[PDB]
Structure 1
Amino acid sequence: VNCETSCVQQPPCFPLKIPPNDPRIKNQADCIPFFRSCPACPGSNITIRNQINALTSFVDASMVYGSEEPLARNLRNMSNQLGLLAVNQRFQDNGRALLPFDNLHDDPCLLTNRSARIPCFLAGDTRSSEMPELTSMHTLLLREHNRLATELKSLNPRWDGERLYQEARKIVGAMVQIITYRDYLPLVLGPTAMRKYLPTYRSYNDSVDPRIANVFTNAFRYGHTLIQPFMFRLDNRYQPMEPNPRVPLSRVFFASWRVVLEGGIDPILRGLMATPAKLNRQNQIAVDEIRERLFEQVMRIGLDLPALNMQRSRDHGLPGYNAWRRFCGLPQPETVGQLGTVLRNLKLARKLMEQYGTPNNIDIWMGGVSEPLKRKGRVGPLLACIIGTQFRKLRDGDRFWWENEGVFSMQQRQALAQISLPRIICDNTGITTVSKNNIFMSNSYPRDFVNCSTLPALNLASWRE
């Protein structure tokens, strides 16, 4: 029953079969490996199979602090009373902190470069080393926590380590909430869906269920359509950083050695700010770096991320496209002509019907990313409904939402309203010219770039006790 090396369909394996005339896998007895998600009730003949969320659903920066207590303690520096998160003891990035290394028995990062001998990083979430751009964001927030704990210690010298850790952790979580709901989500949903699904915050409502819904784990994978086929690294003039300024994505997965030995997080953060995202188009859905070569370096065969999304929605028992359209209050097309009208594209409607027979059977990710995008948004109506509905429950059903009374003082809320992702980059990196707000829209140097001194900073004066 080894899903990694075998093609036998026996629990817990659900391998993806290979179609005839596949462009890459000529052997039809081969497969793309797949392990079914752990069931919430293993072995049951009574319960309808459901899956598990290993993380806190709240937007609480659990990807920095961890979602389980032993890990949360292990991520802390408990050698002193400074409330810091532990940092790498072997390497620094031009004098700045790096994430500590993990101690995995099976480490995939070590495989990406034998001589480098750079293991996976240890962070609040286990996927921190999946791509260096993601590692750079984790490293940025680790530095921001320590920067806040350091400033809070000089402001309140009697605060012990626990107090410093908890107060800096609270600020980091609020920053993630503000960047997400003020800057990020309006650019995902577009203005009209933003007003519909995320109206003005009123107060904490203890009857709003804050759990992640099973469908969101698949729907939020719309972001796979934004992925560029390279990791772009730029110098301090936002010019290509030679000799490898555009590394194919299939050579950066688990490549923690690139962060440590190829220039740290600054060239990566610059590449993220000054390179456009890929645009999702109906005939340009997702790149072959993830469709043919996902984790190619460390697996026996390259994976197909879009196909894994579809097999995963099947594994999770997710209903098809029309059921979700109906759930959202959206019309459900039954014919290829009706599907053509929804998509403003009869050619794509015919290709979808040739695969699925009926729009009732279109896998949720596939149907969701096929819809024309909402004005000033990057999802169509179906994904905007699922995503918008999820983020409203995470906001209204969170007792520690940054605007909920009792979480912060009014003065602290006013100070927090001045934070931004470009400011976090300024404060924790060697980069002094960053994207202007909104960082998620700004993408061209020098047109959309400003110096760090023009941005407001977080004033911690109202945290003095």
Structure 2
Amino acid sequence: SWEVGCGAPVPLVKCDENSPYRTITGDCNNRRSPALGAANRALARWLPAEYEDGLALPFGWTQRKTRNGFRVPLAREVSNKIVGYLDEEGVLDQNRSLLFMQWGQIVDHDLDFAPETELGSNEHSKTQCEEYCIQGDNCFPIMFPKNDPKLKTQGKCMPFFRAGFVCPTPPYQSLAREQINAVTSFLDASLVYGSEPSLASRLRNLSSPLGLMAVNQEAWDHGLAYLPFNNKKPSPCEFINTTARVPCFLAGDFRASEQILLATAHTLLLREHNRLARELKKLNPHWNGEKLYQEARKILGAFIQIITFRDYLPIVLGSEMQKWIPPYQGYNNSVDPRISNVFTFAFRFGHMEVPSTVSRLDENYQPWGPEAELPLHTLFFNTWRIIKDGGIDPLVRGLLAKKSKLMNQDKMVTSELRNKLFQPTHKIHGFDLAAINLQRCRDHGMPGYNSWRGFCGLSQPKTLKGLQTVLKNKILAKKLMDLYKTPDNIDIWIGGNAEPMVERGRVGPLLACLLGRQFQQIRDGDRFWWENPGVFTEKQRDSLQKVSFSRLICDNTHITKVPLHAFQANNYPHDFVDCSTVDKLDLSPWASREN
């Protein structure tokens, strides 16, 4: 115990220390310990991993081996019995726009990514797993329980591959298994710019010396830009409609095209960067290209952090916000800014907020066309609807005018995700996000629910009666007990999300604690936190608290009526105001004079 050694995946760089800009890999943020918070390093472990063989074999891997005496139940069985429901009526969040959910997915994607293992392009293991479901090495399939309707239709399992791990990737040995975070821990807009110098460069337009991001050349959205198309074939975006042949978008983060709405938001940010850059060029004619890139980049980062901490978190945590995130006192170099392995599962509460359908609205916020409301599942890796069916304006209005889904103990995840999820790799619209989340909890060797309740100083129920009290639900507590036999065994993903919500928030006591700590840490340990004295100027900071997502919309679409508070539920037209009634980000404080 104490390694500090093991680390084949660098890639290492030299630190400048007087550079006023963040590296792209996240390196050099912390001067004493320069790799803290960098992309491609192990996720942090707040608690010792809990694997079946104590090292890397996940629970449920070996049939004959129990966990605390009992067999862990199949991911899908838990999915079938606890997580799914049929009635979408009455399910929407009365005070959260659809944007509430989509911002979460953006933030989370800026902070973490544990990609799956490769070791296979020109591979049969990709197929010895999909076709016959043989568990082995990195294939760790999700078996269907008896009486599951996907048996008669899909096969005997859903292919699933274990997450990538530090040092090698290969067979391997030694210490406990640690998963990789392929992105930077700092809230630094890494999802727009990339986390590798390799990708960050491809993304840029180095033809023009104006510091812009490369835009699409085959198509436009009323003279406005779109993200470039990705080079790679086979592309999944052209697969869902072999006819329209539209590839996925190339963006800072690889998951950008996962669903039409996420792609949309990515477009807004790409656009704000370029707009920000042509404006800086206008007041500092003399600045060079990189100067424009970095400074534009720097602003957008500050923007993502403000919206997130000022607008978003307080309605996620509710009354529990001040208790985990006291006000900012300044940079603290003794804080571990690394994303913990558990945070990547607690932040998945967002999955219970995804509604079953997506809408496009017209200028008066009316159904745009005859097939205006689409089932969420026709939108996974759907790029052609944007390019070939209206642009993003119709979708952005839907973001502002529709509601998020409200987590609900009797109605957790929509069937659009629990039964019809499309994986970029396989061919069917038949995966189960819920089962995958659970299978991945085990892949990552996460401690049980009660381990996490103790961590947060919350009571730990040992009995049915005990758990009814904490969940405030007899039916749920029961279902759960029958499957897991002991609360010690409840997987944290479902454990945390089953708890009733906190006052004015959207997650419970356990999740609030986990989320709260993480964010406190990425703020306090981020040398480039926007409020950190010296990072920006007093006059610059003053201009930055006037940013709002509403404005972002005005400056980058042709939408003219927007809500003043985009995250709460807004009705058209009473709640919407004209874009000219809205605080603009004044860039005058970024002007630079010679003598």
Q: Secondary structure at the match of 1:302?
A: strand
2:140 is the counterpart of 1:14: yes
Match of 1:277 in 2: 404
State yes or no: 1:420 paired with 2:553. Answer: no
Q: Which residue of 2 aligns with 1:402?
A: 530
TM-score (norm. length: structure 1):
0.97
CA–CA distance in 2 between the matches of 1:28 and 1:73?
Answer: 42
Per-residue deviation at 1:446?
A: 2.1
Q: Does 1:171 align with 2:264?
A: no
Asked if the contact 1:63–1:125 (Cα under 8 Å) also holds between the matched residues in 2, the reply is yes
Per-residue deviation, 1:116: 1.1
2:312 aligned residue (170, 184, 189)? 184
Confirm whether residue 356 of structure 1 aligns to residue 466 of structure 2: no
Cα 1:76–1:296 shift into 2, 3 Å: closer
SS, match of residue 296 in structure 2: helix
SS at match of 1:34: coil
Distance across 2 between alignment mates of 1:452 and 1:305:
38
Alignment of 1:49-448 (within 5 A): 49-190=177-318, 192-295=319-422, 299-300=427-428, 302-437=430-565, 439-448=566-575
Structure-2 separation of matches of 1:322 and 1:237 = 50
Shift of 1:445: 1.9
Letter in 2 for 1:213: S
Q: 1:34 aligns with which of 153, 157, 160?
A: 160
Tell me if structure 1 keeps the 8 A contact 2:144–2:150. Answer: no
The letter for the 1-side match of 2:588 is A
Matched residues in 1 for 2:182 and 2:419: separation? 28
User: CA distance change for structure 1 residues 296 and 26 in 2, over 3 Å: closer, same or farther?
Assistant: farther
Summarize deviations over 1:137-182 as a string: whole Å, max 9, x none: 1000000000000000000000000000000000000000000000
Higher helix content, 1 or 2: 1
Match of 1:365, as an amino acid?
W
Runs of 4+ in 1 over 4 A off after TM superposition: none
Q: Deviation per CA, 1:25-50, whole angstroms, max 9, x where unpaired?
A: 33796101100001214444221011
Aligned partners of 1:173, 1:378: CA distance in 2, in Å?
A: 25
Secondary structure, counterpart of 1:434 in structure 2:
strand
CA distance 1:97–1:301, shift in 2 (3 Å): closer
Structure 1 gap ranges (5+): none
Deviations 1:176-217 (A, max 9, x none): 000000001111110x21101111011011111111100011
The 3 A distance-change label for structure 1 pair 302 and 296 is farther
C-alpha displacement of 1:94: 1.5
SS at match of 1:197: coil
Q: Which amino acid aligns with 1:293?
A: K
Matched letter for residue 153 of structure 1? K
Q: Distance in 1 between matches of 2:562 and 2:546?
A: 16
Question: In the alignment, is the contact (CA less than 8 A) between 1:32 and 1:301 conserved in 2?
Answer: no
Tell me the distance in 1 between the aligned counterparts of 2:284 and 2:152: 66
Contact between 2:422 and 2:428, CA under 8 Å: does it hold in 1?
A: no
How far apart, in 2, do the equivalents of 1:9 and 1:171 lie? 48
After superposition, the Cα gap between the structure-2 partners of 1:464 and 1:301, relative to the gap in structure 1 and judged at 3 Å, is closer
What is the DSSP-based 3-state SS (H/G/I as helix, E as strand, rest coil) of the residue aligned with 2:577? strand
Q: Residue 401 and residue 196 in structure 1: after superposition, are their counterparts in 2 closer, same or farther (change >3 A)?
A: same
Distance in structure 2 (CA, Å) of the matches to 1:197 and 1:69: 34
Q: Distance in 2 between matches of 1:119 and 1:325?
A: 44
Task: Give, in whole Å, the separation in 2 of the partners of 1:408 and 1:355.
Answer: 53
User: Contact 1:225–1:278 (CA<8 Å) still a contact in 2?
Assistant: yes
Find the aligned partners of 1:282 and 1:195 in 2 and give their Cα distance: 26
8 Å Cα contact 1:20/1:28 also seen in 2: no
1:239, 1:391 → 2: CA distance? 38
Q: Considering Cα pairs closer than 8 Å and 6+ residues apart, tell me whether 1 or 2 has the greater RCO.
A: 2
- Measure the CA separation in 1 of the matches of 2:156 and 2:222: 46
Give the match's secondary structure for 2:422: coil
Supply the distance in 1 between the matched residues of 2:155 and 2:225 (Cα, whole angstroms).
48
- Give the C-alpha shift of residue 294 in structure 1: 0.5
Q: What code does the residue aligned with 2:192 have?
A: V
Contact 1:423–1:455 (CA<8 Å) still a contact in 2?
A: yes
CA contact (8 A) 2:402 2:569 kept: no
Per-residue CA deviations over 1:61-120 (Å, capped at 9, x if unaligned) read: 000000000100111100111100000010001111000001113210001111211101
Determine if contact 1:57/1:212 at 8 Å carries over to the other structure: yes
Residues 379-438 of structure 1: per-residue CA shift (max 9 Å, x gap)? 00111111111111110000010001111000000000000001000000010111222x
**TM-score, normalization by structure 2:** 0.76
Secondary structure, aligned partner of 2:310: helix
Change (3 A) 1:29 1:93: closer
SS of 2:505 mapped into structure 1 = coil
- Farther-moved stretch of structure 1 (168-177 vs 238-247): 238-247
Of all paired residues, the percent bearing the same amino acid is 56
Mapped to 2, the partners of 1:346 and 1:304 lie a distance apart of 26
Q: Secondary structure at the match of 1:389?
A: helix
Give 2:80's aligned residue: none
Evaluate the alpha carbon distance shift between residue 84 and residue 6 of structure 1 in structure 2; reply closer, same or farther with a 3 A threshold. Answer: farther
